Design a protein around this ligand. Sequence first.
Ligand SMILES: CCOC(=O)C[C@H](O)CC#N
Ligand SMILES: CCOC(=O)C[C@H](O)CC#N
Ligand SMILES: [Cl-]
Ligand SMILES: [Cl-]
Lengths: 249, 245, 249, 245
Amino acid sequence: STAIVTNVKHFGGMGSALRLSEAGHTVACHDESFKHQDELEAFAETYPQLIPMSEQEPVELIEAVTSALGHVDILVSNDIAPVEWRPIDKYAVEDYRDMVEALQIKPFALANAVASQMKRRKSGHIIFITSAASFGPWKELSTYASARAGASALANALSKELGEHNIPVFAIAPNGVDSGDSPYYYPSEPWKTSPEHVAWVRKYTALQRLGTQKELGELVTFLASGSCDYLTGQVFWLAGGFPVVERWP
Amino acid sequence: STAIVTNVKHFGGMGSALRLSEAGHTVACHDESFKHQDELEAFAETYPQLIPMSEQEPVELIEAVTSALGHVDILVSNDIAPVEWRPIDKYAVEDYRDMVEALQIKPFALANAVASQMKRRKSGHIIFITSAASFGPWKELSTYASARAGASALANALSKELGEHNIPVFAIAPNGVDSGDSPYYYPSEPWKTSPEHVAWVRKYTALQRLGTQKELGELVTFLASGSCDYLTGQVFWLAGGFPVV
Amino acid sequence: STAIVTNVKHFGGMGSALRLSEAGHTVACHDESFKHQDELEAFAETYPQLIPMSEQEPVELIEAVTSALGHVDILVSNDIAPVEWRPIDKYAVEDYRDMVEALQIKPFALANAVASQMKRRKSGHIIFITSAASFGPWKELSTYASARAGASALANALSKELGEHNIPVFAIAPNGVDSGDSPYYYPSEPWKTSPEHVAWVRKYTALQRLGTQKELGELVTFLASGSCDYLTGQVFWLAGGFPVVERWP
Amino acid sequence: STAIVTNVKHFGGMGSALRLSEAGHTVACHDESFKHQDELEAFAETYPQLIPMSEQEPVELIEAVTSALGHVDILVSNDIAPVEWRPIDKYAVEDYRDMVEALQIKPFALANAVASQMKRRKSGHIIFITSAASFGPWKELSTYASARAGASALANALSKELGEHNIPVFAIAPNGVDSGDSPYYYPSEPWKTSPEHVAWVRKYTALQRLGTQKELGELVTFLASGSCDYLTGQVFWLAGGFPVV
Ligand SMILES: CCOC(=O)C[C@H](O)CC#N
Ligand SMILES: CCOC(=O)C[C@H](O)CC#N
Ligand SMILES: [Cl-]
Ligand SMILES: [Cl-]
């Protein structure tokens, strides 16, 4: 079993890669910083179980992995963009097109690049990492919440055509997952150290804590194992019960 | 009260434009065919209570309506694109982009173009016509279902920020709505006439029939009326109960 | 067209009755207080357009209305119970059975009592008034949120069998609808006068205000008019955008 | 780690009990047939790693497990009732009550009976097995679909208060899961053997097959493991993609 995890330094990247690899997948990793050989080889050295790739674009990346490693069994599309908290009327149309490019077009392109090989052998798994923002409580996140919805609905829709070929498709919609040094989307500073951030979390999530990288990695790996292919199409709300609101004053 | 309905000859266009008009709104209309003065004039003669514009892109359409009728109270973004049933590996990436542009970037642009003047007047209603295909039963409809889902979520997201400025936002997600001569998406031929289509509609929908332009128009007109602003954010599933098994 | 509205003094009762009647329905009204003729006739006097009934139980009530007025076209099941904000382990099983009796069994019994006459003439509308609590943000409302869900799912399920008979079925799930002198569920004191209650509302709803009885009545009446039978099965979230949560600290 | 699985011979019972056991939980089992020492003993011989109880009602079942194995870490409320396809006007009101009691009051009672000891230990997992029939495509299933929806919402509601005490709550809503000899709800005869059933499953579900007890059991065991507590509140749609059109 060979896996691709994208943007491996951010968001759900490391949880996914590290846990897939503990389980025994062979894990090829994409990141933007891997443009640079200095960065690539420092990651390889830091994590000798993982296989970093330099390729950046979807068709590029799939083919390199296929040639180097024989075929792609598991695709984890771990998509990122910075959130821009503007009122609607202060965006340009181009800003949404960029957001949609990074969050919705991307996972479609990776799924387009890899499907035919997966269909041909009647096996594969496909996992999009999206966001609990999809139909959520926030305001002034309109470009971000909607693009994430497009992505979650894509996974569900793909699940229905790819069933005949024995290929499960899933979407994982997180909130409040600790991201360590990564700014996407809950870095340990400030979320783990600033007393207000710590309090906001305790207020508004049912479990009263951040979720861990391990919990997200454990999920990606459960879905990829083939123990429960029958859940195909599921959007998973990986949000620790967020939001909760307290009883009336 | 001034309204804009886009792509007026297709999908929920006529339903929406005609009902708004009966209700006393001044309804400006957009459509691709109004590029051609020829077609525009034919429309205006047939529909003296509607006012068809030639303008095609969102900002010029909004500016032109604003300048000739003096402020948009109501936007109905009636969005359409040719659905092509294909398996995921047979599409060009560029085909998804085109489909997202017509079904998803376009309602954003129209909202983006009208939002600041509605906030200033603290008054307005915004309606996206999307689709019941979002998270639906279909296969090989992946581009369409997902683009339409993006558009529905956009309506919900905007309702949340625009509430504060007294501006309700809605999506209407149809299936099986009669589109007359238009092929977007259930044209009278064949859906009303071919025995085998009539029976498919009768089997997989609860009311056992197609929805009408009057039903669609009546919903748009109620939403826009100011009578039930407190539904803001809602996705209405206009599908007569589809599917049934 | 003849309508029944239940518990007419509470919740969505008056909005429903008054607006149905403005539209030209003949409106028969049920309330618990109508047990007492003193209360009945004061309501009749106060509102001469409306027809109060004394009957309390579903079979009882339907038959009286049918005999007095010829047939029932529109059923508005406007169901109430006091919410009890306990932790789960502090309920008795009986407390949930009571809640389920008042919120879920009741609307089923009224729909059971009236269906056959509606099926026979191939016309009718059925409206349950439930609650946005159904899958909501609250805690320690567990008996209340779930019973309301049972009721909303009932409406949807009934819509699918009653389509062949041209009978639309809907569920209206409110939050924060001003209820005047009624304690179910947002009385004007304190919600309209106490500065904290007013503030909580501004914090957490998108429109930053209570919803009105008129807005709810306008909806029941729109659905009953037959202008848009094609929405059958809809659960309407009549909650003014609740909940919203502010940007990160 | 101690678990309880109810109605163990039906629906998701064996899936759940057997997988939990393989994972090192001590699994107590309940079932109507364990009224009769006869049947209980036959079960215990066949399944030496499972421990069947005779107790029938929620509080005695919980007390008896607590006293013989010393604290319930895991509740799996595997709920069942005979579905009778009838139109709304043909049911007795009392038939809805019975259906609500078995599918909805029962998981409440079991949760109600175990919650305080889990809060004290700040440790526990609670899983309801419900149904994909909630807001589904079926007609004349009104009592069943609604009772199951009540049960699913109960899981979500409890997750919200029990979070604070470190106790995750879940529902699993199945369709088309092989139930072996059990008639709740897809027995091997006929669903595995009759040509016409095999083809219906093949047509209306995306994976074109029935789910297995191993798949169900693997989900329960993952949820209960402590590995992904942050999903708490989730309704898992275990339906292989049903329906498709
Ligand atoms: C705008 C706040 O961010 C989120 O909603 C969640 C984020 O997208 C994913 C995580 N963790
Ligand atoms: C427990 C708080 O009450 C609600 O959720 C809304 C209420 O049930 C209906 C209204 N208005
Ligand atoms: Cl349509
Ligand atoms: Cl099942």
